[PDB]
């Protein structure tokens, strides 16, 4: 059972389909309309059922053309309020009915960010985008807000006619709204059963450019050209992913580049991946994020975690495929380089949380924990470390990739637990059970802290990064002169980033050393968001005041939680920038993404 959901479980009733008919009201910041849920009873004599909601206003519930009784329970914090519907006629097992709910969202919907014209690129039009993962779909429409349930959907979305609506679905046409000529209705169809966290909507002044046989890139006009270039590897990555994962079942693979406050690097909404514009480095260097979102088309979207306790299933497998795609494009040494970088990120997380902290277990117990609060690198990197370790244990990448493909096949269109995965791992590798029985399962899966075993990593591309980082760490004042721009000559941007990641692990460095780095390496001039992020962190943590306005600017001009949260925390912990950091948050708070605002607020204790 799903402790993040207040809805009737899948063992009671299942949503098969949603027809969503809504209007986007920019003047009121509400979505208004009907969610028609096709529900199948799993039980004899079913007379009521419960849906998740959050900050919704229910007008009425209609079954068989008549209003029926419903009640909203008290709010349960971030879970929202359960909505019990009285069925007018007891259902037998497998009977299906359509339940039509008239609802309206609140402006404060935790699933939505509403932007003014000024917060966009064009400055002329407002913009709406959704983000449902993990449990924010309830803040858009009444539903069984649990990934243990999969449904197809259709939608009709009325928006101001000058704007464009897109969803996580195939575009099924547009017409003028008959009820309001200032408006357009966009239509959408999603034929593949999906968990409701994959429902996605954007409305804004969007244009598109084709970048591959099955990929358009969407954004405001100011970002189209740059986006078409940055993500031009998309088709190549899709083919590799299809080779590894099996058929891509989703029809199109489009990309939407969001405004800068989108809270994640990307979101694998089916048919329409959402990405942060912080990927726009000019050189495709951040394309692993595309590979990652592509990989979710199998791991996460076909095979889905049954509850959020098993999020690692979604994320570790996706990181694993992600790194294989990048390894195929750029080589097995690169794959190892990234794998090892990932382990460093896990070291960071476990250090931050504390080695005994519950959120450092692979499988977590989210009972009374907001998934947004528990979210971190752990399920990604500990999940990946487990798979990379098993890969090495079980006979190498070719062999474990055979398992991954069989695993996807086996659990397509299904929702699964860690036990489901482990059972199938044993089934698939039954000739290797003795080897599998050497794994310390309880530790890997259920214990806090770093994994009990570290995989083996090729060091070829890492060595130079460590060597340089060690030079800076061990340098005394009389050694600073010897540093020079040519130190970086043979380092790729990835290596620059790992160099900085290495150094950041030992921060603070002395202020003089950091001043010299800028003098010789000019890191202030690098716009690569990953590098600039780590660089600014190293500056603020080494107490360099000049870096304060640079850190405040990055923290607020984009809102990728990966970058925004630790910049604010760093600024808050630096006594010289502490008050300004708090002040800056308070000023931007109302205009921030509601999830990002809530978490930064917690981080800052304001
Ligand atoms: C005022 N009528 C438009 C409307 C109101 C409430 C909910 C939905 C709608 C839609 C019309 C067309 C697509 S949604
Ligand atoms: Yb010396
Ligand atoms: Zn992911």
XYZ file of C-alpha atoms and ligand atoms in Angstrom:
622
model
C 0.000 0.000 0.000
C 0.884 3.589 -0.809
C 1.418 5.661 2.320
C 1.615 8.867 0.206
C -1.936 8.509 -1.077
C -5.304 8.905 0.598
C -7.217 7.335 -2.323
C -8.788 3.838 -2.433
C -5.958 1.424 -3.333
C -5.716 -0.452 -6.634
C -6.974 -3.579 -4.869
C -10.327 -1.762 -4.388
C -10.844 0.119 -7.665
C -8.715 1.214 -10.594
C -8.854 4.271 -12.771
C -8.640 3.100 -16.389
C -9.047 6.481 -18.123
C -9.290 10.218 -17.585
C -11.017 12.620 -19.806
C -9.928 16.086 -18.741
C -11.858 19.051 -20.058
C -10.540 22.336 -18.639
C -9.961 26.045 -19.220
C -6.771 27.845 -18.208
C -7.691 31.132 -16.516
C -4.662 33.412 -16.387
C -6.538 36.333 -14.789
C -7.565 34.084 -11.862
C -4.641 31.547 -11.938
C -7.116 28.662 -11.882
C -7.775 25.607 -13.946
C -11.553 25.016 -14.156
C -13.432 22.054 -15.592
C -14.233 18.376 -15.364
C -12.213 15.259 -14.708
C -14.233 12.270 -16.003
C -12.644 9.175 -14.411
C -13.488 5.750 -15.860
C -13.216 3.574 -12.753
C -13.195 -0.227 -12.574
C -14.261 -1.901 -9.339
C -11.910 -4.633 -8.099
C -14.417 -5.600 -5.389
C -17.883 -7.004 -5.016
C -20.618 -4.685 -3.771
C -18.533 -1.491 -3.965
C -20.502 1.510 -2.740
C -18.009 4.285 -2.095
C -14.491 5.234 -2.985
C -11.845 7.812 -2.057
C -9.770 10.073 -4.309
C -6.811 12.291 -3.477
C -7.262 16.044 -3.738
C -5.190 19.032 -2.746
C -6.428 22.636 -2.613
C -9.269 21.830 -4.973
C -12.734 23.268 -4.929
C -15.305 20.630 -5.897
C -18.453 22.001 -7.493
C -20.249 18.673 -8.054
C -19.822 14.932 -8.717
C -21.990 13.430 -11.466
C -22.657 9.734 -12.218
C -25.286 8.566 -14.758
C -26.344 12.169 -15.401
C -27.217 12.858 -11.738
C -25.342 14.575 -8.919
C -24.162 12.211 -6.164
C -23.027 12.750 -2.575
C -19.352 13.287 -1.761
C -17.396 14.599 1.197
C -13.948 16.137 1.654
C -12.054 14.972 4.749
C -9.838 17.275 6.807
C -6.533 18.220 5.214
C -3.569 15.994 6.024
C -0.677 18.380 5.435
C 1.166 17.845 2.105
C -1.091 14.855 1.330
C -4.114 17.131 0.887
C -7.709 16.143 1.575
C -9.408 12.790 0.732
C -12.619 12.942 -1.249
C -15.097 10.151 -0.585
C -17.694 9.590 -3.309
C -20.972 7.762 -2.647
C -21.755 5.562 -5.620
C -25.480 5.663 -6.503
C -25.492 1.915 -7.294
C -23.350 -0.830 -5.768
C -20.813 -2.146 -8.320
C -19.899 -5.752 -8.844
C -16.292 -6.800 -9.418
C -14.844 -5.483 -12.721
C -17.833 -3.251 -13.355
C -16.829 0.078 -14.854
C -18.472 3.462 -14.327
C -17.718 7.039 -15.372
C -17.473 9.590 -12.563
C -17.452 13.210 -13.649
C -16.026 15.751 -11.173
C -16.487 19.484 -11.540
C -13.507 21.138 -9.861
C -11.310 24.183 -9.838
C -7.635 24.457 -8.807
C -6.310 27.009 -6.302
C -3.737 29.673 -7.426
C -1.479 28.127 -4.786
C -1.631 24.643 -6.427
C 1.660 22.916 -5.534
C 1.621 21.235 -8.982
C 1.622 24.576 -10.830
C 3.681 27.634 -11.404
C 1.907 30.642 -12.952
C 4.228 33.220 -14.523
C 3.601 36.866 -15.374
C 4.679 38.236 -18.778
C 7.764 39.655 -17.066
C 8.939 36.254 -15.841
C 9.001 34.971 -19.409
C 11.442 35.587 -22.351
C 8.892 37.375 -24.556
C 7.632 39.794 -21.861
C 4.231 39.875 -23.599
C 2.454 36.748 -22.425
C 1.948 34.757 -19.247
C 2.968 31.111 -18.905
C 1.765 28.039 -17.003
C 3.618 24.760 -16.445
C 2.851 21.711 -14.299
C 5.068 19.375 -12.305
C 3.219 16.393 -10.857
C 5.996 14.132 -9.548
C 5.678 12.802 -6.968
C 2.302 13.560 -5.426
C 1.112 16.875 -6.932
C -1.337 15.537 -9.534
C -3.954 15.727 -6.739
C -3.379 19.545 -6.792
C -4.615 19.660 -10.416
C -7.503 17.169 -10.465
C -9.203 14.619 -8.198
C -7.490 11.233 -8.724
C -5.992 8.111 -7.225
C -2.624 9.877 -6.815
C -0.501 6.729 -6.707
C 1.904 5.245 -9.258
C 0.365 1.811 -8.461
C -2.437 2.759 -10.903
C -2.060 3.358 -14.665
C -4.600 4.983 -16.965
C -4.879 6.332 -20.470
C -6.054 9.892 -20.939
C -7.637 12.349 -23.279
C -7.956 16.117 -22.756
C -9.441 19.287 -24.183
C -7.805 22.470 -22.956
C -9.213 25.983 -23.547
C -6.591 28.752 -23.440
C -6.262 32.368 -24.656
C -6.025 32.013 -28.447
C -2.603 33.649 -28.749
C -1.153 30.915 -26.496
C -0.245 27.241 -27.100
C -1.134 24.293 -24.859
C 0.978 21.125 -24.809
C 0.576 17.981 -22.689
C 2.295 14.595 -22.079
C 0.340 13.038 -24.949
C -0.079 13.080 -28.735
C -1.419 16.403 -30.046
C -4.820 15.742 -31.422
C -5.659 19.083 -33.065
C -6.909 22.579 -32.219
C -9.998 24.734 -32.893
C -11.417 28.090 -31.777
C -13.460 27.714 -28.582
C -17.203 27.844 -29.550
C -18.051 29.262 -26.089
C -15.434 32.093 -26.231
C -13.804 33.281 -29.556
C -10.923 34.894 -27.639
C -9.881 31.264 -26.942
C -8.510 28.075 -28.562
C -9.175 24.467 -27.514
C -6.202 22.126 -27.876
C -6.874 18.401 -27.814
C -4.665 15.535 -26.589
C -4.603 11.762 -26.505
C -2.442 9.412 -24.465
C -3.051 5.778 -25.560
C -0.431 4.242 -23.290
C -1.499 3.570 -19.691
C 0.573 5.816 -17.444
C 0.730 6.569 -13.711
C -0.905 9.935 -12.988
C 2.358 11.642 -11.939
C 3.183 11.635 -15.693
C 0.261 13.967 -16.528
C 1.787 17.270 -17.711
C 0.518 20.581 -19.072
C 2.171 23.725 -20.376
C 0.469 26.842 -21.738
C 2.549 29.739 -23.128
C 3.794 31.517 -26.230
C 5.542 28.436 -27.605
C 7.193 27.778 -30.922
C 8.768 24.608 -32.288
C 11.580 23.482 -34.517
C 12.112 19.951 -35.823
C 15.415 18.312 -34.739
C 14.960 14.643 -35.668
C 12.582 12.187 -37.351
C 10.436 12.026 -34.226
C 11.487 15.117 -32.227
C 10.392 18.714 -32.116
C 11.971 21.103 -29.626
C 9.478 23.584 -28.033
C 10.204 26.866 -26.204
C 9.614 30.589 -26.421
C 11.015 31.992 -29.667
C 14.089 33.490 -27.945
C 15.348 29.974 -27.026
C 14.397 27.889 -30.068
C 17.642 28.132 -32.073
C 19.931 27.530 -29.161
C 17.749 24.616 -28.021
C 17.751 22.961 -31.448
C 21.554 22.870 -31.314
C 22.034 21.920 -27.684
C 19.817 18.814 -27.967
C 20.676 17.668 -31.525
C 22.068 14.336 -30.177
C 18.424 13.385 -29.233
C 17.681 11.082 -32.168
C 21.051 9.250 -31.744
C 20.368 8.676 -28.076
C 16.876 7.392 -28.844
C 18.221 4.758 -31.223
C 20.771 3.596 -28.612
C 18.054 3.527 -25.941
C 15.836 1.501 -28.283
C 18.723 -0.884 -28.859
C 19.157 -1.298 -25.083
C 15.602 -0.987 -23.853
C 13.445 -2.374 -26.647
C 10.882 -0.500 -28.781
C 10.043 3.096 -28.022
C 6.270 2.845 -27.603
C 5.384 6.510 -27.198
C 5.162 7.754 -30.784
C 6.935 11.120 -30.572
C 9.811 12.236 -28.394
C 9.471 16.027 -28.083
C 11.423 18.386 -25.870
C 10.069 21.408 -24.046
C 12.623 23.842 -22.658
C 11.018 25.605 -19.751
C 11.497 29.081 -18.299
C 14.414 29.197 -15.818
C 12.382 28.428 -12.641
C 11.510 24.835 -13.626
C 12.645 22.953 -10.462
C 14.445 19.974 -12.033
C 17.009 19.230 -14.719
C 14.278 17.380 -16.571
C 10.984 15.532 -16.202
C 10.193 12.451 -18.315
C 6.604 13.382 -19.215
C 5.612 10.882 -21.920
C 5.862 12.312 -25.492
C 7.139 15.619 -24.109
C 10.202 15.702 -21.826
C 10.484 18.945 -19.862
C 14.031 20.351 -19.436
C 15.604 23.274 -17.557
C 17.141 26.035 -19.737
C 20.229 25.683 -17.528
C 21.166 22.830 -20.001
C 21.852 25.446 -22.683
C 25.635 25.504 -22.312
C 26.296 26.136 -26.034
C 28.248 22.908 -26.462
C 25.929 19.946 -25.705
C 28.065 19.185 -22.643
C 24.988 18.690 -20.401
C 23.330 16.201 -22.742
C 23.499 13.322 -20.219
C 20.256 14.889 -18.884
C 18.588 14.215 -22.250
C 19.947 10.623 -22.224
C 18.487 10.294 -18.708
C 15.052 11.649 -19.690
C 15.041 9.412 -22.804
C 15.890 6.382 -20.650
C 12.798 7.000 -18.509
C 10.748 6.021 -21.585
C 11.498 2.439 -20.442
C 12.574 2.612 -16.811
C 9.943 4.620 -14.949
C 7.330 5.095 -17.691
C 6.927 1.401 -18.758
C 8.229 -0.210 -15.569
C 7.031 2.034 -12.758
C 7.603 2.080 -9.025
C 4.475 0.827 -7.182
C 4.974 3.384 -4.417
C 7.486 6.154 -3.781
C 9.334 3.966 -1.278
C 10.778 2.250 -4.399
C 11.716 5.431 -6.310
C 15.244 4.009 -6.679
C 13.764 1.523 -9.177
C 12.762 4.472 -11.384
C 15.975 6.428 -10.848
C 18.864 3.927 -10.499
C 17.846 2.002 -13.615
C 17.513 5.284 -15.501
C 20.975 6.494 -14.419
C 22.304 3.060 -15.410
C 20.827 3.312 -18.932
C 21.732 6.984 -19.109
C 25.387 6.199 -18.548
C 25.382 3.368 -21.117
C 24.032 5.707 -23.814
C 26.748 8.250 -23.002
C 29.316 5.423 -22.894
C 28.147 4.256 -26.324
C 28.401 7.802 -27.769
C 31.645 8.791 -26.054
C 33.323 5.557 -24.876
C 33.519 3.069 -21.993
C 36.195 5.147 -20.177
C 33.719 8.077 -20.194
C 31.029 5.806 -18.748
C 33.402 4.863 -15.884
C 34.375 8.549 -15.406
C 30.672 9.468 -14.926
C 29.979 6.423 -12.795
C 32.822 7.417 -10.475
C 31.654 11.058 -10.424
C 28.254 9.675 -9.405
C 29.849 7.879 -6.448
C 31.362 11.225 -5.361
C 27.870 12.713 -5.464
C 26.635 9.857 -3.257
C 29.511 10.553 -0.840
C 28.344 14.176 -0.783
C 24.681 13.285 -0.081
C 25.493 10.771 2.656
C 27.854 13.289 4.258
C 25.171 16.015 4.069
C 22.370 13.863 5.506
C 24.566 11.977 7.938
C 25.673 8.413 7.506
C 22.848 6.999 9.645
C 20.059 9.202 8.250
C 16.912 7.323 7.006
C 16.916 9.195 3.672
C 20.272 7.440 2.820
C 18.661 4.024 2.615
C 18.026 2.791 -0.921
C 14.446 1.857 -0.088
C 12.862 4.411 2.227
C 9.713 4.499 4.356
C 7.780 7.631 3.313
C 5.046 7.186 5.954
C 4.557 10.795 7.154
C 7.399 12.078 4.990
C 6.790 14.548 2.174
C 8.534 12.995 -0.922
C 9.755 16.525 -1.820
C 11.593 16.688 1.506
C 13.075 13.163 1.127
C 14.129 13.703 -2.515
C 17.930 13.603 -3.148
C 20.778 11.974 -5.088
C 20.551 8.824 -3.029
C 18.018 6.794 -5.105
C 19.927 7.844 -8.280
C 23.427 7.134 -7.089
C 23.007 4.383 -4.546
C 20.576 2.762 -7.039
C 23.165 3.113 -9.790
C 26.032 1.883 -7.531
C 24.010 -1.281 -6.801
C 23.478 -1.983 -10.523
C 27.079 -1.179 -11.504
C 28.249 -3.479 -8.689
C 25.899 -6.257 -9.900
C 27.028 -5.667 -13.500
C 30.623 -6.372 -12.370
C 29.573 -9.305 -10.198
C 27.443 -10.949 -12.853
C 29.822 -10.828 -15.827
C 30.026 -7.327 -17.281
C 27.941 -4.772 -19.198
C 26.844 -6.964 -22.132
C 25.384 -9.548 -19.735
C 23.697 -7.169 -17.308
C 22.233 -5.250 -20.294
C 20.532 -8.535 -21.294
C 18.871 -8.482 -17.870
C 17.817 -4.857 -18.185
C 16.107 -5.519 -21.503
C 14.367 -8.629 -20.091
C 13.437 -6.702 -16.973
C 11.775 -3.947 -19.052
C 9.961 -6.513 -21.194
C 8.764 -8.437 -18.168
C 7.335 -5.471 -16.271
C 6.092 -3.210 -19.091
C 2.839 -1.351 -18.303
C 3.149 -2.550 -14.692
C 3.986 -1.063 -11.305
C 6.528 -2.921 -9.189
C 8.321 -3.185 -5.857
C 11.976 -3.815 -4.914
C 10.967 -7.445 -4.193
C 9.487 -7.796 -7.703
C 12.830 -6.575 -9.084
C 14.934 -8.822 -6.853
C 12.743 -11.874 -7.605
C 13.122 -11.310 -11.319
C 16.881 -10.687 -10.935
C 17.151 -14.152 -9.304
C 14.919 -15.705 -11.984
C 16.936 -14.212 -14.836
C 20.316 -15.091 -13.298
C 19.271 -18.472 -11.779
C 22.559 -20.014 -12.933
C 24.307 -17.367 -10.816
C 22.298 -17.523 -7.601
C 25.373 -18.435 -5.517
C 27.042 -15.244 -6.721
C 23.781 -13.255 -6.110
C 23.746 -14.748 -2.611
C 27.064 -13.076 -1.901
C 25.402 -9.626 -2.106
C 24.633 -8.112 1.262
C 20.991 -7.399 0.343
C 19.898 -6.077 3.678
C 22.731 -3.526 3.654
C 22.407 -2.440 0.039
C 18.611 -2.100 0.197
C 17.761 -1.158 3.782
C 20.796 0.320 5.563
C 21.768 4.026 5.758
C 25.161 5.367 4.638
C 27.545 4.527 1.805
C 27.017 1.072 0.202
C 28.847 -1.889 1.837
C 30.933 -2.430 -1.338
C 32.342 0.062 -3.843
C 32.403 -0.932 -7.505
C 35.674 -0.864 -9.488
C 36.219 2.202 -11.658
C 38.548 2.848 -14.566
C 40.526 5.983 -13.576
C 41.849 7.176 -16.967
C 39.824 10.405 -17.306
C 39.626 11.035 -13.549
C 43.390 11.016 -12.741
C 44.184 14.464 -14.183
C 41.244 15.970 -12.217
C 42.453 14.514 -8.920
C 46.066 15.466 -9.715
C 45.116 19.105 -10.287
C 42.785 19.208 -7.261
C 45.555 17.747 -5.071
C 47.957 20.445 -6.320
C 45.626 23.188 -5.207
C 44.830 21.544 -1.852
C 48.502 20.888 -0.933
C 49.764 24.244 -2.313
C 51.251 26.829 0.042
C 51.426 30.543 -0.807
C 54.808 30.185 -2.511
C 53.295 27.551 -4.891
C 50.464 29.760 -6.225
C 52.702 31.425 -8.803
C 53.222 28.114 -10.532
C 49.539 27.754 -11.407
C 48.702 28.836 -14.944
C 45.928 28.670 -17.583
C 47.789 25.829 -19.322
C 46.897 23.601 -16.344
C 43.442 23.279 -17.980
C 44.603 22.856 -21.610
C 43.895 19.143 -21.918
C 40.792 19.015 -19.658
C 37.338 18.701 -21.141
C 34.456 20.616 -19.493
C 33.490 17.357 -17.790
C 36.971 17.163 -16.315
C 36.867 20.845 -15.335
C 33.660 20.034 -13.493
C 35.140 16.959 -11.776
C 38.251 18.989 -10.820
C 35.912 21.487 -9.165
C 33.811 18.733 -7.583
C 37.032 17.242 -6.130
C 38.157 20.554 -4.742
C 34.708 21.389 -3.389
C 34.829 18.191 -1.331
C 37.690 19.787 0.688
C 36.262 23.339 0.929
C 37.033 25.806 2.364
C 40.351 26.381 0.659
C 42.307 29.471 1.756
C 40.939 32.710 0.309
C 44.255 33.457 -1.426
C 44.150 30.133 -3.294
C 40.605 30.828 -4.564
C 41.554 34.373 -5.621
C 44.483 32.878 -7.546
C 42.193 30.325 -9.263
C 40.135 33.156 -10.643
C 43.292 35.027 -11.623
C 44.710 32.067 -13.591
C 41.641 30.103 -14.703
C 38.981 32.828 -15.065
C 36.169 30.555 -13.827
C 33.968 33.655 -13.419
C 33.629 33.691 -17.222
C 32.260 30.113 -17.564
C 28.503 29.972 -18.143
C 28.300 26.182 -17.999
C 25.745 25.893 -15.173
C 27.255 22.785 -13.560
C 30.742 24.346 -13.434
C 29.588 27.805 -12.409
C 27.465 26.197 -9.652
C 30.435 24.284 -8.164
C 32.751 27.272 -8.636
C 30.421 29.663 -6.822
C 29.906 27.139 -4.032
C 33.702 26.846 -3.572
C 33.998 30.681 -3.467
C 31.221 31.282 -0.928
C 32.406 28.348 1.240
C 35.980 29.715 1.072
C 34.551 33.094 2.305
C 35.164 35.195 -0.839
C 32.854 38.254 -0.624
C 33.189 39.174 -4.290
C 31.367 35.958 -5.127
C 28.296 36.909 -2.997
C 26.462 38.903 -5.724
C 27.405 36.212 -8.275
C 25.941 33.472 -6.066
C 22.766 35.526 -5.312
C 22.295 36.150 -9.018
C 22.596 32.453 -10.002
C 20.415 31.386 -7.071
C 17.520 33.588 -8.186
C 17.827 34.012 -11.984
C 17.207 30.317 -12.412
C 15.447 27.991 -9.994
C 16.714 24.464 -10.652
C 16.564 23.117 -7.141
C 19.868 21.312 -7.634
C 21.497 24.787 -7.972
C 19.157 27.172 -6.085
C 18.977 25.242 -2.796
C 22.678 24.769 -2.102
C 23.558 28.317 -3.276
C 21.042 29.741 -0.784
C 22.311 27.383 2.013
C 25.917 28.359 1.279
C 25.001 32.061 1.290
C 23.037 31.604 4.535
C 25.957 29.860 6.241
C 28.405 32.612 5.199
C 28.057 35.250 7.939
C 28.803 38.105 5.471
C 25.978 37.067 3.099
C 23.537 35.600 5.639
C 21.140 38.557 5.967
C 21.076 39.301 2.261
C 20.373 35.615 1.487
C 17.326 35.608 3.794
C 16.166 39.002 2.471
C 16.553 37.857 -1.137
C 14.529 34.699 -0.501
C 11.725 36.709 1.228
C 11.493 39.050 -1.767
C 11.418 36.316 -4.409
C 9.365 33.821 -2.401
C 5.907 34.735 -3.777
C 7.196 34.607 -7.362
C 9.054 31.305 -6.984
C 7.903 27.761 -7.797
C 5.753 26.628 -4.799
C 7.819 23.482 -4.146
C 11.171 25.321 -4.533
C 9.881 28.165 -2.262
C 8.744 25.673 0.412
C 12.063 23.783 0.448
C 14.394 26.817 0.291
C 12.280 28.214 3.158
C 12.914 25.032 5.167
C 16.629 25.045 4.244
C 16.957 28.668 5.460
C 14.705 28.133 8.480
C 12.557 31.152 7.553
C -17.119 28.899 -19.507
N -17.013 27.692 -20.319
C -15.718 27.097 -20.643
C -15.329 26.053 -19.607
C -15.659 26.302 -18.269
C -15.340 25.402 -17.257
C -14.673 24.232 -17.588
C -14.333 23.964 -18.911
C -14.654 24.864 -19.931
C -14.232 24.471 -21.312
C -14.613 24.727 -22.627
C -13.834 24.044 -23.586
C -12.799 23.219 -23.135
S -12.857 23.345 -21.354
Yb 57.068 26.118 -0.175
Zn 15.034 10.527 -13.348
